[PDB]
Amino acid sequence: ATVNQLVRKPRARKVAKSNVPALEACPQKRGVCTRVYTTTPKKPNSALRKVCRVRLTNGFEVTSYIGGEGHNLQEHSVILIRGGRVKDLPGVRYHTVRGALDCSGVKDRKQARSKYGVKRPKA
Amino acid sequence: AKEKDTIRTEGVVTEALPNATFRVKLDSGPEILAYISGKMRMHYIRILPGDRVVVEITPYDPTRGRIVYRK
Amino acid sequence: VIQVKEIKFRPGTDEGDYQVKLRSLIRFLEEGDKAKITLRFRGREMAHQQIGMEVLNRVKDDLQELAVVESFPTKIEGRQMIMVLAPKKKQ
RNA sequence: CGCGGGGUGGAGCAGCCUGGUAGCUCGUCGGGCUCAUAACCCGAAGAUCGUCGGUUCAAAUCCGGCCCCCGCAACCA
RNA sequence: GUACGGCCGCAAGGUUAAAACUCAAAUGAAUUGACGGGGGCCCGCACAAGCGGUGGAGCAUGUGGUUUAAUUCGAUGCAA
RNA sequence: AAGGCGGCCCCCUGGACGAAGACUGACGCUCAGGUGCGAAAGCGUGGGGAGCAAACAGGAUUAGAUACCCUGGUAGUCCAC
């Protein structure tokens, strides 16, 4: 409180701790698929959510979501990951970029295609 | 859409894990983590550690399955 | 004479809890009583293939020194199974 | 011929060197408590005290045999 | 109030004091209920005070159960 | 000052408050670091030991009862450093 006190010990803003450290301030990172599996989510939800463990080009190894309905990914699949947690999946803090590198687009999508790596259907 | 690679194979409740969780051993081959289906939990239907049960298994993860048919 | 006292071994009574009261069950036997084990399954007329005869059998097998059992019963009556345990009989 | 500890009621004990109707537990069958069951509580059934000879007023407990179980001991290659 | 480092202690331990990770909460006071092996105060044939019953018997009747080709459907604690 | 301090008597000693006036003349307030104090339990050595009582033993209760209740009871609770 005292002026004297601040003069001895200045106000010191807290440094923000990141939510996607594996990215190291990069917009995406590349990595190899270590395990490709499903996992169940947290109260109150229930499903078999597709996730993968991915060793990134910078050594970090993280779990990443594989959004969309259907995917053709396996071990040694080289994928691109981006920031973005999965809320009912604790530990999951990244998303896989559908339709980049070895990851295919979602099949048969018509709405929100660009978020699922899907070309515009000839029509 | 909802793909259709789901299955309904049966099995028997083995373990009585925590939070409506079970070891359910598929008559078929092995057993899976099996969690209690929402429906089923909403209609209660307790589930003893040794019942014949129906499972919904996504090829995506055979290791897991949902209990559909109560007993 | 030889009395009937009793112990129970419910499911979820493993090593921890269990052999502490295998110590209790020695005590019963070692008074010179016939110490009757009662299982009390979360279960049925065939509750288990697990619940009972891990416990019971290992209670015998650990106590086997001092006590033996009359029978390894494995006929449950109700939702509970008595294994009967006695002093080890001098031939 | 080779050691240990025991034999009591359906099962396991106490009553022992301190020799006068053998009592204490689990089971058994009833009764009580509960809406009911488990659990618990009041109770009754249940014995040549291994079997004999000795020994004594009367010996469960007193000695030694016959005999049995367990103990380790052993079938120790 | 943990770890690592330092100082301290015979020891038990103390003192100074982080980060990763994880959640969208955690928290304070007050409000309306409900609940208390919770408590206070107060009412109702609730108890107490009485008179007559039901529970036993035979029959009427409803239900359950059992039976049947069918014994039609419904009502099920007080409130069938 | 806080921790805490209770039979009675003496000895040594700290602080607080009141009355009156004299003296000193801002000698004051606060205080990181430093130093000292600091219930109970606990520790070390030697004493002491009635009552109480961790531990521990026995009796009960209980489905269990390493508890609550009972019969005992060691450290400790007491003194010096």
UniProtKB/Swiss-Prot annotation, chain A:
Q: What is this protein called?
A: Small ribosomal subunit protein uS12
Could you tell me what this protein does?
Answer: With S4 and S5 plays an important role in translational accuracy. Interacts with and stabilizes bases of the 16S rRNA that are involved in tRNA selection in the A site and with the mRNA backbone. Located at the interface of the 30S and 50S subunits, it traverses the body of the 30S subunit contacting proteins on the other side and probably holding the rRNA structure together. The combined cluster of proteins S8, S12 and S17 appears to hold together the shoulder and platform of the 30S subunit.
Assembly and oligomerization: Part of the 30S ribosomal subunit. Contacts proteins S8 and S17. Interacts with ArfA. May interact with IF1 in the 30S initiation complex.
Determine if Nucleus is one of this entry's keywords.
Answer: no
| Cited NCBIfam families | rpsL_bact
Q: Which domain of life is it from?
A: Bacteria
What HAMAP family does the database record attribute to this sequence? Ribosomal_uS12_B (MF_00403_B)
The N6-acetyllysine modification is found at K107
The record's annotation in InterPro entries points to:
NA-bd_OB-fold, Ribosomal_uS12, Ribosomal_uS12_bac
Pfam families, per database record: Ribosom_S12_S23 (PF00164)
UniProtKB/Swiss-Prot annotation, chain B:
Which intervals hold domain S1-like? 1-71
* Pfam families cross-referenced by the UniProt entry: eIF-1a
Q: How does it assemble?
A: Binds to the 30S ribosomal subunit, contacting protein S12 and the 16S rRNA. Component of the 30S ribosomal translation pre-initiation complex which assembles on the 30S ribosome in the order IF-2 and IF-3, IF-1 and N-formylmethionyl-tRNA(fMet); mRNA recruitment can occur at any time during PIC assembly.
Encoding gene, per UniProt annotation: infA
Cell wall biogenesis/degradation keyword on record: no
Write down the Gene3D superfamilies for this protein, in alphabetical order: Nucleic acid-binding proteins (2.40.50.140)
Q: Which family does it belong to?
A: Belongs to the IF-1 family.
Task: Give the function comment from the record.
Answer: One of the essential components for the initiation of protein synthesis. Binds in the vicinity of the A-site. Stabilizes the binding of IF-2 and IF-3 on the 30S subunit to which N-formylmethionyl-tRNA(fMet) subsequently binds. Helps modulate mRNA selection, yielding the 30S pre-initiation complex (PIC). Upon addition of the 50S ribosomal subunit IF-1, IF-2 and IF-3 are released leaving the mature 70S translation initiation complex.
UniProt protein name: Translation initiation factor IF-1
Q: PROSITE patterns per the record?
A: S1_IF1_TYPE (PS50832)
Its cellular-component GO annotations read: cytosol
InterPro entries recorded for this chain?
NA-bd_OB-fold (IPR012340), RNA-binding_domain_S1_IF1 (IPR006196), TIF_IF1 (IPR004368)
Source organism per UniProt: Thermus thermophilus (strain ATCC 27634 / DSM 579 / HB8)
Compartment(s): Cytoplasm
Q: Which UniProt keywords apply?
A: Cytoplasm, Initiation factor, Protein biosynthesis, RNA-binding, rRNA-binding
Question: Mainly resides where?
Answer: cytoplasm
Q: Name one GO molecular function term.
A: translation initiation factor activity
Curated annotation (Swiss-Prot), chain C:
The Gene Ontology biological process terms listed for this entry are: response to cold; ribosome disassembly
- Which chain positions carry the site (Important for 30S binding)? Y18, K21
Q: Which family does it belong to?
A: Belongs to the IF-3 family.
Has the keyword Oxidoreductase been applied to this entry?
no
**Keyword set includes Phosphoprotein:** yes
After translation, the protein is modified as follows:
Phosphorylated on threonine residue(s).
Subunit structure, interactors included: Monomer. Component of the 30S ribosomal translation pre-initiation complex which assembles on the 30S ribosome in the order IF-2 and IF-3, IF-1 and N-formylmethionyl-tRNA(fMet); mRNA recruitment can occur at any time during PIC assembly.
Name the residues that span the membrane.
none
Purpose: One of the essential components for the initiation of protein synthesis. IF-3 binds to the 30S ribosomal subunit and shifts the equilibrium between 70S ribosomes and their 50S and 30S subunits in favor of the free subunits, thus enhancing the availability of 30S subunits on which protein synthesis initiation begins.
Give any extra note attached to this record.
Answer: A short form called IF-3S/IF-3 beta is found both in vivo and in vitro and is probably produced by degradation of the long form IF-3L/IF-3 alpha. The major form is the N-methylmethionine long form.
Keywords per UniProt? Cleavage on pair of basic residues, Cytoplasm, Initiation factor, Methylation, Phosphoprotein, Protein biosynthesis, RNA-binding
The principal localisation class reads cytoplasm
A GO cellular component term found in this entry reads: cytosol
Q: Which part of the complete protein is shown?
A: 90 to 180 of 180
One GO MF term: ribosome binding
Localization terms from the record: Cytoplasm
Q: What is the designated name of this protein?
A: Translation initiation factor IF-3
So which domain of life are we looking at?
Bacteria
